[PDB]
Amino acid sequence: MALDLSSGFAAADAIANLQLADATLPIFEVLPVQLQFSVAADFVAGQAANNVLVIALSNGRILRIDLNKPEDIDDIDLPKKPSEVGVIRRMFLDPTASHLIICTSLGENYYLHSQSRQPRPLARLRGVVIESIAWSPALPTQSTREILIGAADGNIYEAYIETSTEFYRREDKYLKLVQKLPDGPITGLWADSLPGHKDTRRVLVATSSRLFHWVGKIGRGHDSGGGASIYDKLFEAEQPTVHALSGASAAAMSMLVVSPDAEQPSPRFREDEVPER
């Protein structure tokens, strides 16, 4: 194990040097991470954000490894489960926080945080199938955060929740439907801010058959009563951008990403004002 990881790393380095020696620079070098895990279970999913690596195991085990100090490993032991529980299929790690969301093939959703280590199920989702859940980084990791629910039925729910470390202890506070996607199940939701305005954000939804885009607010006036107000307006307006992906014999699972750079040319809108993120 440990000796094979070291040799695999050295071999990967030799390969990167051979690629440039034989031809041209690869630009991106690919090397294995030397993780010394004596784990029989196979990896099924994972994340890498906020300086932490996350490994999802087929038996539900969660591994949290520092990305800058890989020797620092937190191995979290879950409660015993039946084989009927299935495996973890999707993972989301808050890009600006240590909070982790675990999603399984059964639609079960668990929240995990290093304060308690061991993950807990959300009671409010026991009767609801959610493929993936995510948090919006458009809000500061200090007080109020906005949650995005990637429902399997295409129903997108949103709420403004005050940080309490463990977010599974909240009784659906200010949680309401904002958008509906009848065309297919959501693979997950991702979000960021809109730099042209101090209180505005953007959220995208990925589904197996469609892509939708809509907007909302990140102002403090929307943390409670104003939250419900803006959600109603966005729902009633019913004017998202819609794109389709063919169901060409594929699961069509996908992820939404952000590109935080406006320095380079982009030959569709090369104007004086070039948007970031």
XYZ file of C-alpha atoms in Angstrom:
277
model
C 0.000 0.000 0.000
C 2.220 2.855 1.312
C 5.174 1.668 -0.768
C 2.991 1.326 -3.853
C 1.572 4.818 -3.441
C 5.072 6.282 -3.324
C 6.149 4.362 -6.421
C 2.954 5.336 -8.244
C 3.696 8.983 -7.488
C 7.277 8.736 -8.710
C 6.092 6.988 -11.868
C 3.521 9.713 -12.509
C 6.259 12.323 -12.194
C 8.443 10.397 -14.628
C 5.527 10.288 -17.057
C 4.994 14.040 -16.896
C 8.688 14.530 -17.668
C 8.563 12.028 -20.527
C 5.566 13.774 -22.070
C 7.424 17.075 -22.351
C 10.724 15.412 -23.248
C 9.159 13.512 -26.156
C 6.835 16.261 -27.395
C 5.635 19.494 -25.786
C 4.639 20.602 -22.304
C 1.346 18.949 -21.177
C 0.449 22.144 -19.291
C -1.378 20.030 -16.724
C 0.458 17.250 -14.916
C -1.453 14.308 -13.470
C -0.278 12.562 -10.303
C -1.928 10.222 -7.718
C -2.584 11.305 -4.144
C -0.638 9.215 -1.637
C -3.468 8.313 0.732
C -2.636 5.451 3.087
C -6.126 4.054 3.658
C -6.579 0.462 4.788
C -10.173 0.460 3.558
C -11.753 -2.591 1.919
C -14.687 -0.577 0.566
C -14.325 0.942 -2.902
C -14.639 4.670 -3.577
C -17.981 5.641 -5.121
C -17.917 9.452 -4.992
C -15.927 12.395 -3.645
C -15.174 16.125 -3.394
C -12.207 18.487 -3.215
C -12.864 21.996 -1.951
C -12.009 24.425 0.844
C -8.664 22.675 1.380
C -10.365 19.333 2.149
C -10.593 16.076 0.166
C -13.717 13.986 0.656
C -13.990 10.289 -0.099
C -17.332 8.509 -0.206
C -17.223 4.759 0.323
C -19.732 2.168 -0.860
C -20.341 1.258 2.786
C -21.204 4.858 3.711
C -17.827 5.608 5.312
C -16.632 9.202 4.957
C -12.987 10.236 4.799
C -11.886 13.863 5.209
C -8.294 14.657 4.216
C -6.555 18.035 4.283
C -5.466 19.049 0.762
C -2.404 20.977 1.937
C -1.405 18.538 4.669
C -2.440 15.084 3.328
C -1.120 13.271 6.399
C -3.954 14.876 8.384
C -6.796 12.379 8.042
C -10.210 12.322 9.720
C -11.830 8.892 9.297
C -15.533 9.054 10.201
C -17.298 5.887 11.388
C -20.983 5.716 10.453
C -23.795 3.694 12.135
C -24.290 0.161 10.822
C -26.481 -0.075 7.726
C -28.051 -2.942 5.697
C -26.923 -3.636 2.127
C -30.392 -2.406 1.168
C -29.228 1.121 2.032
C -27.344 1.273 -1.273
C -24.269 3.403 -1.947
C -23.291 7.069 -2.067
C -23.677 8.428 -5.598
C -23.321 12.193 -5.311
C -21.276 14.468 -3.067
C -21.159 18.200 -2.389
C -18.580 20.059 -0.338
C -19.255 23.706 0.414
C -16.554 25.530 -1.624
C -16.070 28.101 1.145
C -16.809 25.967 4.218
C -16.037 22.622 5.854
C -19.684 21.514 5.780
C -20.273 18.385 3.685
C -23.422 16.974 2.079
C -23.751 13.245 1.362
C -26.353 11.919 -1.096
C -27.231 8.278 -1.821
C -28.986 6.308 -4.573
C -32.035 5.918 -2.323
C -32.566 9.682 -2.192
C -31.331 9.819 1.400
C -29.475 12.960 2.439
C -27.038 13.352 5.317
C -25.226 16.413 6.653
C -21.694 16.149 8.011
C -19.475 18.584 9.911
C -16.168 18.123 11.757
C -17.752 19.474 14.948
C -19.737 16.240 15.304
C -17.914 14.152 12.657
C -20.672 11.549 12.287
C -23.327 12.495 9.643
C -27.048 12.766 10.354
C -30.137 12.269 8.104
C -32.641 15.027 7.410
C -36.055 14.115 8.815
C -37.802 16.571 6.498
C -36.603 14.602 3.469
C -37.744 11.175 4.666
C -40.768 11.312 2.353
C -38.906 13.186 -0.395
C -36.340 11.960 -2.916
C -33.471 14.403 -3.468
C -30.601 13.459 -5.793
C -28.319 16.275 -4.640
C -28.221 19.214 -2.207
C -25.875 22.214 -2.195
C -25.120 25.501 -0.430
C -24.739 28.871 -2.148
C -21.326 30.616 -1.698
C -23.015 33.846 -2.763
C -23.598 34.454 0.948
C -20.743 35.037 3.464
C -19.690 32.215 5.780
C -20.450 34.279 8.872
C -24.192 34.253 9.552
C -26.951 33.542 7.036
C -26.467 30.947 4.300
C -28.758 29.980 1.431
C -29.587 26.330 0.771
C -30.446 24.822 -2.605
C -32.465 21.579 -2.782
C -31.896 19.557 -5.986
C -35.097 17.494 -5.878
C -35.440 14.369 -8.034
C -38.908 15.546 -9.063
C -37.579 18.798 -10.531
C -38.853 20.889 -7.616
C -36.223 23.402 -6.525
C -36.584 24.574 -2.953
C -34.634 27.380 -1.306
C -34.228 28.744 2.225
C -32.234 31.316 4.181
C -30.748 29.579 7.213
C -28.680 31.052 10.053
C -25.429 29.151 10.582
C -25.566 26.781 13.542
C -22.821 24.412 12.351
C -25.328 21.562 12.024
C -28.021 22.450 9.487
C -30.092 19.281 9.860
C -31.511 20.622 13.121
C -33.594 23.272 11.356
C -37.317 22.709 10.855
C -37.576 23.791 7.215
C -37.223 27.438 8.190
C -38.254 29.734 5.331
C -38.189 26.799 2.894
C -40.345 27.246 -0.204
C -40.517 26.189 -3.861
C -38.827 28.670 -6.185
C -38.555 26.904 -9.556
C -40.003 23.767 -11.163
C -38.324 21.520 -13.755
C -40.905 18.936 -14.985
C -38.570 17.681 -17.719
C -36.301 15.595 -15.474
C -34.487 14.984 -12.139
C -31.873 17.389 -10.792
C -28.264 16.188 -10.638
C -27.486 19.117 -8.349
C -27.580 22.882 -7.816
C -24.720 25.390 -7.823
C -24.548 29.136 -7.256
C -22.390 32.249 -6.996
C -22.720 36.034 -6.689
C -23.345 38.617 -9.422
C -20.456 41.179 -9.183
C -22.466 43.911 -10.914
C -24.736 44.199 -7.864
C -24.070 43.969 -4.129
C -27.279 42.118 -3.206
C -27.759 39.821 -6.216
C -26.820 36.194 -6.990
C -27.141 33.611 -9.778
C -28.196 29.961 -9.499
C -28.070 27.192 -12.095
C -29.787 23.806 -12.072
C -28.532 20.700 -13.817
C -30.920 17.907 -14.765
C -30.577 14.765 -16.850
C -32.677 16.361 -19.601
C -32.443 20.143 -19.065
C -30.515 23.178 -17.844
C -32.283 26.139 -16.227
C -30.960 29.477 -14.957
C -32.558 31.953 -12.536
C -31.557 34.761 -10.164
C -32.193 35.953 -6.609
C -30.954 38.150 -3.761
C -28.269 37.876 -1.069
C -29.216 40.965 0.941
C -29.748 40.710 4.704
C -33.270 42.033 4.235
C -34.134 38.687 2.641
C -32.941 36.479 5.502
C -36.456 36.010 6.900
C -39.723 37.582 5.752
C -38.025 39.087 2.700
C -36.835 35.587 1.816
C -40.361 34.330 1.264
C -41.146 37.526 -0.650
C -38.332 37.200 -3.196
C -38.982 33.478 -3.630
C -42.607 34.178 -4.575
C -41.599 36.795 -7.140
C -39.073 34.479 -8.788
C -41.558 31.601 -8.899
C -44.418 33.666 -10.330
C -42.260 35.359 -12.976
C -41.585 31.972 -14.626
C -38.845 33.298 -16.936
C -35.687 31.104 -16.632
C -33.403 30.330 -19.562
C -33.902 26.759 -20.757
C -31.538 24.395 -22.583
C -31.872 20.692 -23.367
C -29.627 17.633 -23.400
C -30.601 14.584 -25.457
C -31.340 11.344 -23.597
C -28.919 9.500 -25.862
C -28.580 6.245 -23.920
C -26.910 7.945 -20.959
C -27.536 8.660 -17.277
C -26.755 12.251 -18.247
C -25.418 13.122 -14.807
C -23.708 16.514 -14.766
C -22.189 19.282 -12.635
C -22.285 23.076 -12.648
C -19.055 25.062 -12.374
C -17.769 28.655 -12.186
C -14.949 30.441 -14.053
C -13.701 33.384 -11.888
C -11.734 35.286 -14.547
C -12.540 38.216 -16.851
C -9.011 39.041 -18.057
C -8.921 36.875 -21.184
C -10.733 37.368 -24.544
C -14.098 35.674 -25.012
C -15.295 36.233 -28.611
C -19.031 36.571 -27.995
C -19.031 39.631 -25.741
C -15.618 41.300 -25.999
C -16.845 44.629 -24.647
C -15.358 47.097 -22.167
C -17.336 45.412 -19.390
C -16.538 41.715 -19.036
C -18.410 39.722 -16.322
C -16.597 37.670 -13.686
C -17.422 34.240 -12.271
